[model samples]
Target: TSCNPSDMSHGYVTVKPRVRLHFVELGSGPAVCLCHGFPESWYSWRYQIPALAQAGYRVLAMDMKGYGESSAPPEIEEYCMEVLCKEMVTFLDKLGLSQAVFIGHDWGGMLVWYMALFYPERVRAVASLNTPFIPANPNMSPLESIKANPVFDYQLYFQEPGVAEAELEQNLSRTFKSLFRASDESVLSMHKVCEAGGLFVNSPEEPSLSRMVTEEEIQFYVQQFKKSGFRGPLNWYRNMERNWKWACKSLGRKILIPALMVTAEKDFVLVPQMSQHMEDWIPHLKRGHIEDCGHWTQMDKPTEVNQILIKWLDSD
Candidate 1:
């Protein structure tokens, strides 16, 4: 029930007192860390790990705090972006890395944006998949944004403590099946989910995805979530307002690092246009889009994503 890592090996590191992060590390040469988003583990970057290592980069894909085997502090405030960013920087520091290339997906991507913004000296370069850095708005909280834009109503559902955790934990397999996909089957409920407050209307109609992901792989995610539960992962969503407050201090700031964004074209929740303004926010930014890919970019279209990622990392 482990991740797909032929060469990578598992290990744990003590980043802070009483906080240990579990990760899968392999390859050699310059270090690059991969951070996975919600409802995922180090396994989320399975497709990119070997490819990046072969491209002459030491890859470290970690299960962010509260996901996988990493420490999941019970307090909701602990999941704030500032706290997550500090943990990430401390992780690198504990590993004796003065600087590292950090890449993230989903919330992981959002944290890396905070890393580049708050702890610029720690990150050599940064890249994000699916998620983009929307400058921190001091005036509006994330909840307000969700209310204003119904597309983010899912945030409202997640913000309610115990609701999403209870629903998702009740059926881990179904949660994965409902969330991870390249098809539009789940797209019909874009606005409905806001009012309905359900991630899926009913049992997912037999699996039909644009990209290939075996049933065996899906089962792995189920097993992991079964053991880990959804509370820790759900807390990430609960910290939206606190994250907003923490990040607003650097609202006008821009990421000066060499940045890359590989947006999934078919990703309903996060479209490529979400990153359109990223160029204005990231000076040395490189962009690419994978057609037919969904939120799970690394899993659905590894080859295309790897091609763009390696090219960007290799350049100068």
Candidate 2:
């Protein structure tokens, strides 16, 4: 029934090796497999999924392994890029799609790049939102990178593994949910804590009070984290050395398929160069940046994001 277009379809497909990936399939036509970034689940695509589906493309979004209802393995190696890449191929098989447009944002973007490289035949096209291929997901000393206190990159500390997990243990759910972009300060406020502890510390004054989210959405996030801790998702950042090794194994290689990379200009966490390198990395690539949005481009600027995605997909 997942193939049926009449109703919004929901299902969980076991990608095996300790991961029971949860997925939602909507609309109908050629498939589009969307991946979510760090601090997010399949629900992150709420703004674009239905839109793509109604546009006559099969939209499939998922709570990646270790997120939401998806099964999370206790082992650290389970989240490694190589193993995770294999699992994604298996995921595509479950959908009966040998090839589909693979799109991602943040960590999701990292997944699609690896997905395209490892299983090129399985991807018809590629897209990355916000974050791009950071050479290696390096996990270094958290204390080593701090500059002026407030301006810092958390991935280095996130790589340490033990520290970040412990810091967010009491509030892993909140840490994950807080990653959503609410304003210019929203992205920066979260970045500061990461600079200090490679963890998230919610500010007393959050601007999300005016967001489209309802109490129901907050409850949904709370329940999702209760099922799995942040360790699995954080492990994604833990394997930077492994990712660097893999990416370096093939240098100057580009995605053979058409690609799109969208940047949110108002998003402070991401710098301009993040989207700039695509010109060289992908052979066929285009970039779209939104002026009014912060980090959550799709949600913060839904109509803008939708139009861009549709125009790109339609033009080609």
Candidate 3:
């Protein structure tokens, strides 16, 4: 009954080497595993977590392998897709959950895509936000996106062991402060055209900083991110070839389970063409287009995001 937001009830199951990965449990009823994306912790789903729990669904927003209080080893191989999804699989098995709804955003969204495939039996349903299942990006040739970023350029640096760590350690507050930008039109627009570290310039000014996030939320993420820096999170990119190779094995393997994809119309990461692949891989799919919403749909528009999710859960 503790109302402390940071204090989540702890549980874990043994993985190889007997490492105990941490997970947080809340709410009650049919289980829903909430997975957060790169450079984020389970805290990303804090808004959605309690809401879902209050609606009669058990929610487990996990810290993932290298983020938050979960294990953060330097072994990039341990962070591979197989081991990544394996942890989710083992989580369900340990909790005696035969199957449950799974939702992901960003990198977490990518993880559930493979989870739904590799172990379909354990996934009752799946939903992803922003990072769409473009038959392209997932199976995309790296060169197409390589020239694009901080997202892209950072990869070159992240692929190096100490590069990101050194860089972030040198600028932890500045990094988080950089993320907390003033929401400007041109700034937000740059998410599309401006590449080469122009993210801050294009970021829209946050009129209400706490609209999507708070000082406490920012501090929590900053603290954890400051720990592993950004390399481990960026390692997911280094596995692009690995992801593509893995995706090849599932060729023509459609997601037979119920699937929901919500795209923020303004999402630069996966644009209009993002939802173009639903017909290819998702047999039963529902697509929701959220207007005026950006990449951070869940937080940028939490009420809308929640309603869409609830409607999707009970949809035709």
Of the two candidates 1 and 3, the one with more favorable lDDT, higher being better, is: 1
Instruction: Provide the overall lDDT of each model, using Cα atoms, as 2-decimal numbers.
Output: 0.78, 0.71, 0.70
Residue 70 displacement in candidate 2 (angstroms): 1.2
Model 2, 139-223: lDDT tens digits are 4432443453434466656667578778666764454345553674353344555445544544533334436455556566666
TM-score of each: 0.92, 0.84, 0.85
Query: Which regions of candidate 3 are displaced past 4 Å?
Result: 1-3, 136-141, 144-154, 180-212
TM-score for candidate 1, please give it.
0.92
lDDT for 256 (candidate 1): 82
User: Model 2 misses residue 125 by how many Å?
Assistant: 0.6
For model 2, give the 10-residue run with minimal summed lDDT. Answer: 1-10
Q: How many backbone clashes does candidate 1 have?
A: 0
